[PDB]
């Protein structure tokens, strides 16, 4: 078909006037929604795609200059939506990908009818007044590991560091999929995420947002949901589920899927 549809492995399923766009998280691909897609194809038009950093995409198309900032991902998402004639889409995103969708909505409000977010966060590095992510030091370890893996691959030696070698046991679950990419692309995406912060821009989002978090999550504090509700510029709702892990939509489908489907089908927020 189109070049954008071939560079992102875009697939269209289902039928009906309403379109659901599933944006996977960093380190995985559209395969993470294989448990959710059957629940939607009956009465929705599901659009699945892989963002350019994903392992299923061509490593050559990856532009280190464009994708050193989240604006690149938001622009890519807008291009994908506009190519496939998708308007008033319903966006379901995982962590830090829903942020890109939110920025895209800031630029192009007409494309997004609602935003459903799974464990999102505006800024990943917590400051003294901001408890909305992880300490800088605990993530410095993961940056070091990714840099060492890239160095090892440059010399032709195997990259021998994983997220299982960190000590947080929460960085292990958070950063597990960050090592599921080519080491240089992994370094680039990780540095972008570390430098990312959308706190100023939270007031410009007008589309409704449906924040979904895990009960007593060790990884992203539950208070971030209330923080976003207070700073978001549009209607917002927060639901908490008794799930765990970085990928509740895959590891615990019988609990996560009902929540996501409900938030998709109810508009009142």
């Amino acid at each position: 078909m189109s070049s954008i549809g071939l560079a992102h492995n875009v697939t269209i399923l289902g039928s009906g006037e309403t379109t659901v766009v599933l944006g996977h998280g960093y380190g995985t691909d559209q395969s993470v929604w294989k448990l959710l897609v059957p629940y939607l194809v009956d009465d929705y038009k599901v659009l699945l795609y892989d963002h350019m950093g994903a392992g299923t995409t061509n490593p050559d198309y990856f532009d280190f200059d464009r994708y050193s900032s989240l604006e690149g991902y938001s622009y890519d998402l807008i291009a994908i939506l506009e190519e496939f004639q998708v308007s008033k889409c319903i966006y379901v995103g995982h962590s830090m990908s829903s942020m890109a969708a939110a920025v895209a909505s800031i630029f192009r409000p007409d494309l997004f009818h609602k935003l459903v977010m799974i464990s999102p966060t505006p800024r990943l590095i917590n400051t003294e007044e901001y408890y909305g992510g992880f300490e800088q030091k605990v993530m410095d370890e993961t940056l070091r590991s990714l840099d060492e893996n890239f160095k090892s691959l440059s010399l032709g030696t195997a990259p021998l560091l994983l997220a299982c070698d960190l000590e947080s046991a929460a960085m292990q679950e958070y950063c597990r999929t960050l090592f599921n990419m080519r080491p240089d692309i992994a370094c680039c995406i990780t540095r972008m995420i570390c430098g990312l912060d959308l706190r100023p821009y939270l007031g410009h989002v007008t589309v409704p947002c449906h924040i979904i978090q895990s009960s007593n999550d060790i990884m992203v504090p539950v208070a971030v949901g209330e923080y976003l509700r207070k700073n978001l510029g549009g209607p917002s709702v927060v639901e908490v589920m008794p799930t765990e892990g970085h990928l509740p939509h895959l590891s615990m489908p019988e609990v996560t899927i009902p929540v996501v489907l409900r938030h998709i089908r109810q508009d009142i927020t």
């Binding site: 399923l13 395969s31 294989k34 994983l162 090592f179 599921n180 892990g245 895959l250």
Partner: protein, 641 residues
């Protein structure tokens, strides 16, 4: 004199003898005469390429007789689809490129694939269908199998040992045209992916349709608990309907599985352990009905007891019998005083394979050795009573002919015990299999040893292999390792590496099978404080670059819960370090970023991701494999100079 001065007929004769395809390709580049000779002489071809560029198919292979289309990239892709009208042209393309095909193996992803490709060769003699994917929905049973029946068809052998389907498809297809079934001289249905084995009625109908069968293998259901399970009537129907049988292989579907936790009665949570509807009298009648029988294999997951009389009748009623494989048959060897009995009376056996025999003792092994003096291959599995003395003496008795020994899951026979047991035949054995069990309580040159198979539980090390006795193997060339187990319950290894560098001890080693695919673990998300599968892949693959491997088959560990066998980053990184690799097959999935790691290997020619397990990923959305990724990788590999 030089060869070009030789007459051409003995050139065709001499050059039909190079079977090594790499050597054949090398010979084709010698000169014009040699090229023409090779192209007119090549008989077996396994097609290598992508579906997209299949119209760039060479026509130089006009004289091939056996054609293998199941390895067309992307692996498992529908070669012909009903969605594209020009897919009708693929049949003609193949028909014209290989006009002299008699044996065919094709991947039958879709019914249209069969209906377009198979009837192309009226002289087709042997057919092998492969499908590890889902069975497409059809109007009735056997609709995709009915497409095999062609007007001018004379199909003689049908192979469905890897073609997943409903067991009701076979009898429906076989009943639709009596000519097609009568022409059949061989039928292989030994598919382990069947959810349940064939019913009694289905076996009866299958054998009634095909009275001329010479070889018959089937995956039957022998559990008495189920309804319509195959029992005595099924076997007597086999004996009555197929009197010309020379090979008879009935095994339960669980017995065919790669994982020992599926067929081992000890490892099943009380499953099995109950008698089948198989009597000694019924076995006697069955063996009496097959005077021409040559190869027998009855591998059940349900016990059959007091089978000694049946095995004795085997010796009188099957003079041509050469190979016997018995699964959970008890009392096969019950010696009294000194008179041989049971299987020990089959003096004509050449290979014997027994499994989970409760009655067997050391005297049983001694009787088997003394009676079956022509035995050349012996396989024993899961016998809790036999010891090193009995097995060593049985080896010494058969020291003149025994060249292939497998000793697995024997409680009292560890790795060191097995190697000590094989001492009398140490300088003659060629193929060897042991379990790397280091916890079993209670001049050394393997001069002819060429193949070693190992089984080891997950988390154990391989370093003690040298101290176990397998020290000096000058001729050892291929080793196959299978690792099984559930690592979700296991802690982090205290030792950093599995120890593949220990395999540097054998200088001639050039091929490997690393089957970790039966390890269950956590793919991308571990619950809390657990270790994901990438850690175990690193633990197992470290040091694989040091070995001068030239071929490598790798089975990534799986996560049964989410159904994925992904290749991790450390796995790809370590496999990249193998510079000498020529062929590299990975029986799993890997996305483009990791697949492109392998272009660093200079000598690498054949690479493929083969999902030959059930169930294979249905489409690109459900896994991390994409068709475009495969095409880009292949184009990059071919272009490398």
């Amino acid at each position: 004199t030089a060869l070009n001065d030789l007459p051409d007929v003995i050139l065709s004769n001499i050059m039909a003898g190079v079977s090594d395809v790499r050597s054949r390709n090398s010979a084709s580049l010698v000169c014009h005469k040699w090229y023409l000779l090779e192209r007119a002489t090549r008989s077996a071809l396994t097609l290598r390429g992508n579906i997209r560029d299949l119209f760039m198919l060479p026509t130089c292979f006009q004289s091939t007789s056996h054609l293998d289309l199941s390895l067309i990239s992307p692996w498992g892709h529908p070669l012909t689809s009903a969605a594209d009208p020009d897919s009708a042209l693929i049949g003609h393309l193949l028909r014209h490129a290989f006009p002299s095909v008699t044996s065919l193996a094709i991947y039958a992803r879709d019914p249209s694939t069969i209906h377009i490709v198979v009837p192309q060769w009226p002289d087709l003699e042997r057919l092998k269908l492969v499908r590890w994917h889902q069975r497409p929905q059809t109007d009735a049973a056997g609709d995709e199998l009915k497409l095999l029946i062609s007007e001018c068809g004379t199909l003689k052998s049908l192979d469905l040992s890897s073609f997943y389907c409903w067991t009701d498809d076979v009898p429906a297809a076989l009943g639709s045209c009596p000519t097609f079934a009568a022409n059949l001289k061989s039928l292989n249905l030994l598919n382990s992916s069947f959810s349940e084995g064939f019913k009694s009625d289905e076996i009866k109908a299958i054998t009634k349709a095909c009275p001329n069968l010479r070889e018959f293998r089937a995956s039957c259901m022998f559990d008495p608990r189920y309804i319509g399970h195959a029992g005595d009537e099924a076997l007597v129907s086999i004996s009555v309907n197929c009197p010309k049988l020379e090979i008879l292989h009935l095994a339960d579907t669980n017995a065919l599985s790669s994982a020992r936790s599926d067929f081992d009665p000890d490892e099943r949570e009380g499953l099995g352990q109950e008698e089948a509807k198989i009597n000694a009298a019924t076995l006697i009648e069955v063996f009496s009905g097959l005077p021409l029988l040559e190869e027998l294999a009855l591998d059940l997951c349900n016990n059959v007891r007091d089978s000694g009389p049946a095995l004795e009748v085997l010796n009188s009623k099957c003079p041509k019998l050469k190979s016997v494989k018995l699964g959970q048959f008890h009392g096969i060897s019950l010696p009294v005083e000194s008179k041989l009995d049971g299987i020990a009376l089959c003096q004509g056996l050449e290979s014997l394979s027994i499994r989970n025999v409760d009655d067997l003792t050391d005297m049983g092994l001694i009787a088997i050795g003394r009676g079956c003096y022509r035995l050349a291959k012996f396989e024993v599995y899961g016998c809790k009573k036999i010891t090193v003395r009995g097995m060593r003496t049985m080896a010494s008795l058969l020291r003149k002919t025994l060249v292939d020994v497998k000793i697995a899951a024997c409680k009292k026979l560890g790795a060191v015990q097995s190697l000590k047991a094989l001492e009398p035949i140490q300088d003659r054995v060629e193929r060897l299999h042991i379990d790397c069990d280091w916890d079993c309580p209670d001049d050394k040159t393997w001069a002819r040893l060429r193949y070693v198979s190992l089984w080891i539980f997950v988390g154990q090390l391989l370093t003690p292999l040298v101290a176990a006795g397998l020290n000096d193997c000058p001729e050892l060339e291929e080793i196959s390792i299978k690792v099984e187990g559930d690592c979700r319950v296991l802690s982090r290894p205290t030792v950093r590496e599995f120890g593949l560098t220990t395999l540097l001890n054998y200088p001639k080693l050039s091929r490997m099978h690393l089957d970790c695919g039966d390890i269950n673990g956590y793919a991308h998300t571990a619950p809390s404080g657990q270790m994901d599968l990438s850690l175990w892949e690193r633990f197992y693959l470290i040091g694989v670059g040091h070995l001068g491997l030239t071929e490598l088959n790798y089975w990534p560990p799986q996560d049964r819960d989410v159904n994925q066998r992904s290749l991790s980053l450390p796995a790809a990184g370590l496999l990249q370090e193998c510079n000498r690799l020529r062929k590299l097959f990975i029986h799993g999935t890997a996305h483009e970023h990791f697949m492109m790691f392998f272009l660093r290997i200079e000598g690498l020619r054949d690479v493929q991701l083969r999902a030959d397990y059930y169930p294979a990923p249905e489409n690109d959305m459900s896994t991390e494999m994409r068709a475009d990724s495969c095409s880009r990788f292949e184009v990059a590999l071919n272009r490398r100079q």
